[PDB]
Predict the structure of Neurofascin.
Amino acid sequence: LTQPPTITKQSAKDHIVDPRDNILIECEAKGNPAPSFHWTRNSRFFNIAKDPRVSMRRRSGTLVIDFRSGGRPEEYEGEYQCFARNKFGTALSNRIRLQVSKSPLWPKENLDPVVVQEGAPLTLQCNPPPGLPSPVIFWMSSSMEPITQDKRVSQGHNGDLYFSNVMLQDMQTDYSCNARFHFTHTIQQKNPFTLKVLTTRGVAERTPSFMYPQGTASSQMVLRGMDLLLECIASGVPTPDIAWYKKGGDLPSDKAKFENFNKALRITNVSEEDSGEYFCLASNKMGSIRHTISVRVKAAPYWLDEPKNLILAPGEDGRLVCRANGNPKPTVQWMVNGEPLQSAPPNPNREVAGDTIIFRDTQISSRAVYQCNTSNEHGYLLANAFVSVL
Amino acid sequence: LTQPPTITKQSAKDHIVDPRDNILIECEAKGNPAPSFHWTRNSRFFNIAKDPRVSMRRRSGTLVIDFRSGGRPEEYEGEYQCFARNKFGTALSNRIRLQVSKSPLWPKENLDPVVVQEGAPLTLQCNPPPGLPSPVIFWMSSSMEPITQDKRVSQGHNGDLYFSNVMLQDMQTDYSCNARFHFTHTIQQKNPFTLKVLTTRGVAERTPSFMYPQGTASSQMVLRGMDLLLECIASGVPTPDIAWYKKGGDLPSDKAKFENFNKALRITNVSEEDSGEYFCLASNKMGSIRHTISVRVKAAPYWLDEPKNLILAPGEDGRLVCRANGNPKPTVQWMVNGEPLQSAPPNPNREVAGDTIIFRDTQISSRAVYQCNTSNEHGYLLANAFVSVL
Ligand SMILES: *[C@@H]1O[C@H](CO)[C@@H](O)[C@H](O)[C@H]1NC(C)=O
Ligand SMILES: *[C@@H]1O[C@H](CO)[C@@H](O)[C@H](O)[C@H]1NC(C)=O
């Protein structure tokens, strides 16, 4: 029966949508008395009433927009936050950054016909327009024939097409960069590149070079839990081979997978242990060079000690611990029903110790719905926890 | 020196544009005194001044819109007409129907898994969203592999995929209809069809049937000068062959081309002679049926006798003949400087005889810029011709 508000469901922290079926910023909550809801858009009170498009729901705060009457979601991009309040206190949802799933066109460009000496290297740079999330990329002939890839010719993760050495058959098709988008499935085509190779009467066998990762070394930061992608594209006449190593250690055979005609190396659920120096070798015939990649592993906050609701008997000492591990180390900010602790109705029964709160002689009053934001450069965590007396 | 206005350049009758680089409704003209320009949008005076987007040009009437400040071309679709006026008279441009090059998305649909008995026929209907002009269509696996076509499996001009008889290998891929648009090059994908064929232990050899052109006969109207496309898709176990004929005549070996694994027949620059009854045969092993297509050839107007400008000596009888051949036969409407003849400043020296005007005792006055609209159901022609006295 007598329990303060608690968020039941909510739209994702990163709520992305296509201009198709109208938006649904979700927010639901429990509570003894059915909670009332209000919203903020970019930190200012979001006035539902003066907006024709948006409307609230059956016994909930879930919103619904409607563009069936001359409207565009491109103006409706921003940070949303739901507030669930009842007689006891108020609980908050995450900060919903609603963004439109763009599948934009390529800038109009009259491309130069590509002329390169035979056997020499070439990089057909794609450079796609943004779009969210990143579009899957592939190369096709302008007449929709799939371009076959091998150790000699392959694409990098950025979408660029890499020719180790340009042969004569590379004129058996033209080359157009395609970008397939995730949820709209729209594909955008960039103008076809026409290759005009020049025969210079020479197999001139050359030492290998580094095409994509420029020069000698490179650094990479990567988030705990995400994937780590290492690449090495080489330009050599006798088509170069790539090989991989980690300095003073073995590459984890389970988490690691050679991709792209050995040109790339993925490590899946990366952790601190996966940081350090990795290197690759472009093992030609006339030589063998090396690239060194430095991998540092930073981390978005993840819960060590998430605060839970507190049901205490009058007079009992209670405590809330909000601790997350991250890199850089997370910060803790406390809130009482949305209002920042600093400017909250004073309470003598409360002692604050950074990430730890302690409630001595919990009494009749003092029933509220505390918040915890633990954050760092790379992310945050928001916990709701109430302090009800029995 | 002393010559009335004459249109030099103008945007195409069907001026289609992508929301990309801002619109350019062109209109230029000659004339002794440099002509002044104004426009109509959907038959009412188009007020440039109260519109921020549009602007006129250096010594011309060519317009230019600009959406760099919160605007959409979808509201700017309509019929435009340029008016070039000088001290003597006024000449008009064609009615420019400006339309936006749409490459719209497919309606959201959860498709049914396709289950069909082996050897039996099936039609994977594409049914694409409009877009202008019509999108080029093809079928691909959801992972971008091209679906190979043959006499057994091929697509109709409407985009539907036709299985004469469904084999077992037809499960070696899924099937998604793709629509590539002409000038934007955007491709839209419809959800993949998953085929689950059922082996029923039977090669049961069957009589052929007509898949696309339904039943026995079909009619087709086609415009003079355009292409004529005839199709016949058959459903038979021993994969049917298609053959073509014209009743009481030979198919023109020069203008005709067998396409689509013989399943279609194109005749290029069609004229009246190309009308009549064509038929095809689905020549199976167990039988051979026939479809009859009736082709009638109608025609948009084309000039027989286009009116030219008139330079006459005072007192000389002149004449304007405006005659176009079409089917249905064209209509003639005359205008004096945009104003319809019926409500024009009366002139005794002018005798009208349908498509023919005659100016007796051409005098000092009477210098104007007459118009001719010859039209029928399928199109029109607009000629400007002035009547200057020497
Ligand atoms: C938590 O704090 C960080 C940094 O102050 C901020 O960017 C983030 O939006 C906050 N989250 C919430 C829901 O308060
Ligand atoms: C010519 O007349 C037809 C039918 O009245 C009309 O649809 C067409 O727009 C006219 N063309 C012009 C430029 O007057």
